[PDB]
Amino acid sequence: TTLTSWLDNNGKSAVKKLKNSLPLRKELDRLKDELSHQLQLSDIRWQRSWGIAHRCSQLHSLSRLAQQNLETLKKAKGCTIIFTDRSGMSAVGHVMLGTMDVHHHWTKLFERLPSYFDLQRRLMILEDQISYLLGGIQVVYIEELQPVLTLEEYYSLLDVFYNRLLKSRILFHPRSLRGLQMILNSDRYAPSLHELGHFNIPTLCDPANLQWFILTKAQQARENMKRKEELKVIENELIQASTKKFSLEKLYKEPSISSIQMVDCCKRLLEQSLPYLHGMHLCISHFYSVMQDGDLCIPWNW
């Protein structure tokens, strides 16, 4: 158990860093809820780590933009905003302001919202067509499993797949209605069955090979869609119990962490007690580190 030594060495700097970092957290909350109220946005989110100091600067810049141009910015009622590395609208309708763009680039984006909204209806109609084609099959855009896709690129993928596949050969059956989803993978190798329960299927694929692949593993997919949810529920209860035991402000995970890994992580914490974990922020990651704003990174491997 080297985490004991690591904690004993690095806890004091962590508590000092937290004590320094509280005011920036207060300021971030104030800026976020003020901006959310003013523009009537549904939510504001971030896609990368980034520290409380850079997030505050991004919120300040957006506030300045709203101060200068208010009428054009007002076109985003009910639209949630995410901060990314590229601009444009996402595959499921998020304004993705990009960290490396000046206000002149954002203002252009906020003046093109109606056309993007129009394109969204066409994409939804395409979704419905593909759904009725293979029998009821939801086509989903699962982020953190696909590259960041702008609306036009996803529409082009859907269009090329539907056009190049329907014209040549076709097979129909209204089964698979309740479950089974398609990632629509962008042509990596070949169709495959992901562990969660969905399918990442390349575009322009062979309809015969696609049919043979799909027809045979329905039951395993249906079994996976229930395994995933019941592990998620046991995770909710374990992560509540750990916070109760050690009195953490919040305990969370990196997006890349598998749920089973968090099973094992929480289970092999709950049988041990450590002094310095009291009243701190802890996150599950891949390395031993302390963040500049006062968070601890404990790898899921002791």
């Binding site: 207060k26 300021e27 600067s57 919120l59 300045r64 960290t99 000046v102």
Partner: protein, 422 residues
């Protein structure tokens, strides 16, 4: 596109001035000479006046208030080459203990970084340029010990900063501060070579921007490769750094900072140029007894920077106030056509001269002259008053440099050297 005013309310300025003058740690001991500098800073702050060192605090603190990271890097920048800023204080008794007064201005403020670099211009400038292209919410400044040592990094300037936006889409707003001015110093301590930067500009002298355009400037700045400026007052230096950030876009900025004006008694400005509703001034008009009776003035001299305070002293010594009108030019980059056209109209009958510190084949002449000739319909030949051409930036003999300055001031106020020719 438009730019908000860069002024600030008075209480912010007073708080910033009080913080910089005061030392946050009572236990910390400050060198007696440094303590006198801190006391003089308070002297000025209570009287509502700023020198050159205080304007830099009042720009950096005002930017740090609204979550803008600031990184000042260079060669001996924590104290200053001419020992004028003292951004970092050292305890005389306890070793390794340090205070930065600008990190204590407000409880919720953005990070500030001052670092002394290794002895290198070609790696450090590249490092800073790479740092400046990772986010538009930071102000990265590179300081040169003297403006003459920048050519060691010429490659970076020629290949990355100059054409970077035309060759690749990325926008970058790095600021370069280069001390400049001829003061009887060694040739390699005189002239940062502004004529080399001014010729890389993609502006066309023959082409004239339409007078009837919005602001005209938010469009002159936009239709330009980078902005160059030669500030002569601390108020303008305060306004430029704020305009760099409040603009909708980013472009590189080249400021030619002074050397002997850091202690010049009349090179300071009031708080009234920093209050809300004030703007950066590209051309500073002629204000004085001459503007009251324009027809009486027989000559109009255009200058830039440190020369101004030399010409004004000569004009009074000769009883020529009201006979000569001196005008400063502050930007030079996207040349200001509209304002300068009005100045010629203001004095119907006055020959136009360009007065200059450097030699004829260096400095700002031969960039400025075609542009000044473009604004008028060649109504008046633009004359020249300054030093003769030479191969080296400045002379190594102190005696000749004084004589040269004297003959420069002699030809500026003669009123008949070119008058007989015209």
């Amino acid at each position: 596109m438009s730019c908000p005013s860069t002024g600030l309310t008075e209480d912010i300025l007073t708080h910033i001035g009080n913080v910089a003058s005061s030392v946050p740690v009572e236990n910390f001991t400050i060198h007696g000479g440094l303590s006198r500098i801190l006391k003089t800073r308070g002297e000025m702050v209570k009287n509502r006046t700023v020198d050159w060192a205080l304007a830099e605090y009042m720009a950096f603190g005002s930017l740090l208030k609204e979550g803008i990271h600031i990184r000042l890097s260079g060669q001996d920048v924590e104290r200053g080459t001419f020992s004028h800023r003292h951004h970092v204080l050292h305890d005389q008794n306890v070793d390794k203990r340090t205070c930065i007064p600008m990190n204590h201005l407000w409880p919720n403020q953005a990070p500030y970084t001052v670092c002394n670099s290794s002895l290198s211009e070609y790696g450090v400038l590249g490092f800073e340029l790479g740092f400046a292209m990772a986010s538009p919410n930071a102000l990265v400044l590179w300081e040169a010990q003297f403006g003459d040592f920048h050519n060691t990094a010429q490659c970076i300037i020629d290949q990355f900063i100059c054409p970077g936006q035309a060759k690749w889409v990325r926008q970058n707003g790095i600021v370069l501060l280069l001390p400049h001015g001829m003061e009887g110093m060694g040739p390699e301590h005189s002239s940062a070579r502004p004529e080399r930067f001014l010729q890389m500009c993609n502006d066309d002298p023959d082409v004239l921007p339409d007078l009837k355009e919005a602001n005209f400037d938010i469009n002159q700045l936009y239709d330009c490769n980078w902005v160059v400026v030669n500030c002569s007052t601390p108020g303008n230096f305060f306004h430029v750094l704020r305009r760099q950030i409040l603009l909708p876009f980013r472009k590189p900025l080249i400021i030619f900072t002074p050397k002997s004006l850091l202690r010049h008694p009349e090179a300071r400005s009031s708080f009234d140029e920093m209050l809300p509703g004030t703007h950066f001034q590209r051309v500073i008009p002629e204000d004085g007894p001459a503007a009251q009776n324009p027809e009486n003035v027989k000559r109009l001299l255009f200058c830039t920077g440190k020369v101004y305070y030399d010409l004004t002293r000569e004009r009074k010594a000769r009883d020529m106030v009201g006979q000569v009108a001196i005008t400063r030019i502050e930007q030079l980059s996207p040349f200001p056509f509209d304002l300068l056209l009005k100045e010629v109209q203001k004095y119907p009958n006055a020959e136009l001269a360009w007065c200059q510190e450097e030699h004829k084949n260096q400095g700002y002449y031969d960039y400025v002259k075609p542009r000044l000739r473009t604004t008028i319909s060649r109504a008046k030949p633009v004359w020249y008053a300054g030093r003769d051409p030479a191969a080296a930036p400045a002379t190594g003999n102190k005696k000749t440099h004084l004589t040269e300055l004297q003959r420069l001031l002699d030809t500026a106020f003669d009123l008949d050297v070119f008058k007989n020719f015209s």
